[PDB]
Ligand binder design. Sequence first.
Ligand code: CL
Ligand code: CL
Ligand code: CL
Lengths: 402, 400
Amino acid sequence: HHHHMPKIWTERIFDDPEIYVLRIDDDRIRYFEAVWEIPEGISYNAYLVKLNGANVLIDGWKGNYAKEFIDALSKIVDPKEITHIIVNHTEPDASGSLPATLKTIGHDVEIIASNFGKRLLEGFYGIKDVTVVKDGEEREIGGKKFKFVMTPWLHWPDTMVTYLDGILFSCDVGGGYLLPEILDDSNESVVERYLPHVTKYIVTVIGHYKNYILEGAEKLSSLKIKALLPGHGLIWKKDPQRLLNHYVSVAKGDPKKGKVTVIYDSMYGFVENVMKKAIDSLKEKGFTPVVYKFSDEERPAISEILKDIPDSEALIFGVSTYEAEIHPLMRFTLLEIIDKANYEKPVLVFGVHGWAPSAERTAGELLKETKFRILSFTEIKGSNMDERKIEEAISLLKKELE
Amino acid sequence: HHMPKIWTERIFDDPEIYVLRIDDDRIRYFEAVWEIPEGISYNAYLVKLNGANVLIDGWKGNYAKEFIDALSKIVDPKEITHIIVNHTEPDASGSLPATLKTIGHDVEIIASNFGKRLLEGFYGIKDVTVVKDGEEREIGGKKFKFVMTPWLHWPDTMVTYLDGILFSCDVGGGYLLPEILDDSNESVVERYLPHVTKYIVTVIGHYKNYILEGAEKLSSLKIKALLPGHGLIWKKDPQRLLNHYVSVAKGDPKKGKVTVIYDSMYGFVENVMKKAIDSLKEKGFTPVVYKFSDEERPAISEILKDIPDSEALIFGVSTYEAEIHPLMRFTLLEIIDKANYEKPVLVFGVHGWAPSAERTAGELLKETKFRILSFTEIKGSNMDERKIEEAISLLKKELE
Ligand SMILES: [Cl-]
Ligand SMILES: [Cl-]
Ligand SMILES: [Cl-]
């Protein structure tokens, strides 16, 4: 139960151009896109640029906060004075407030989007009068030059970024989960605590298209960037390159020394017994394991597993079998890793030798179609398990990472 | 500090039979997957006979010490002579190593063929008497009959018949920690049965055809009592429990029941499904609704429990990247695996820009027993509500 209304920020963050952020902190939402566990919440950031002869709204808020958005907006400008609305991306977490915004303005305005964005505004809302902008197209508005850069598949085909005097309104690109205690990247401690939640956002929202992050960062690199103002999380006025470098590093899967992520199901405790030993062996050898275990008492968040993949030196899977080859949570977890975090990293598989029908795909053969490099398979036995084979696998991994 | 509740009670006089039941209120996910906030009991039995004492099954391994202590209150463990293992899964057999140690001398362990193999694999136990289908054994002056019921839900599964009393372990079990031991209270029985259905679909669902086979196999035996490894003991009306098992396995429907399952990423699916659900209610159906949204996430075990007695299902599906929404994928795969029934379905789905390569909900349902009466596209603005009305009307007609 929430004791207070969501926090709203409304603040001028630049003098020239005169730019305001309108940010609402969604601490109601539990599952982003109705799937990714985000107990930390997410912000929706829209922007208002007040110019000479024009007032430009950039993006908006999720639809359940439409009324709050209009109230907030009306505190910094008479909505009737709005002339342009730029829609970088049409997903309803950014565009949900648009119908109520259009009604409140009460007259036609120029709505600007990508080609695909125009089609989607029609499909979602019935909005038909939209100006399509092309890649690199410039537009003079209120005496300033706006430039629009298409960055498709980050993470929809309609995605673009808006460039104004070195200031990039990037919507999802550069977004992150978490409700930071400040607006921007001015505090180092804030930045360090925020970045893991940026990783979590990249992998969950953009991970399937992680190769396009590399494309997009390179495309954006050619522009003079003085600040990056995304649709979620922190605004980067001080060091936007650090954010871009983080995005690229997550996309490439640059590893953190000693990090090994160990993911397993233990249906009855036999997998646990082997994996506890695998984990102890790792700690003995200088590694710092991150452990996700599906047991009869505990159940990790898939969003948290995914977040830890990119900077792992390696993964280890422990797979319960018995009657079937892959049990439901392991299967879900593998399929999501395949979909969102397909990296060229070494992997150990430990598995129970069950009596599953031969036609059933094993965890190994699912993994064998990915970029992951399975070093070895180790059988999880019951009473006559040979602990030396566990030590063997961990030593094999240590040598591989050496 | 709180301790899980243990029941030890003599439940028959001749033969002299005791139940030892522990109510597991710590477990959250049965088999590490099925959401069971209601918990589950482990029921073992001791039969005290003339010249023998026979333990039948046991408890989960984390309760081994509680098991020995409970057992020691009704018999000196050294006086045990036989242990019958209906099924080797650790929720029933985890206590076996500690029990053998406490007994302190050799006993005859009896199991099925696959049972003996699994006892060796799990625990290194090699001295086990294998009994065959229909084999009878004289023990302590009584005749014990063994009946193989494989794939309920493992190939080692058997049941033990003793003068009309069936020790059935998993067969006839259920989730929930019932307020009493047995089937002597109607309202307790009523509240309990849906938890039996939940247990059947989740644990045995994939092999539901073998329930029907098992039912007619036991049909040649006069069952006066059913003593399963989980949940309620049935002494008054074990037939009622058997009929329930069969009805779930057949998927006998409750008239008017439609289960509606959907994900709504941003409210567009929600808007279509709200009209669908309303249309069902106005036509006299009683929908059961499961919504994956950005605030709510139903338990898959609850969705599964409602499938067998639904007249029909309705799915509302969002497109996601190349495929469908991950939670609906997971849910479809489990329904197909555990609840593959010959029932009608409506699909409502958003039109995506997904790669044509990847699988849709309909393709997933192709090799199953479900039949899709129609597919209806979910749109934002300009959604033709008449399409929703006609889909529901079509379903009503199909169900007459
Ligand atoms: Cl296990
Ligand atoms: Cl939706
Ligand atoms: Cl899945």
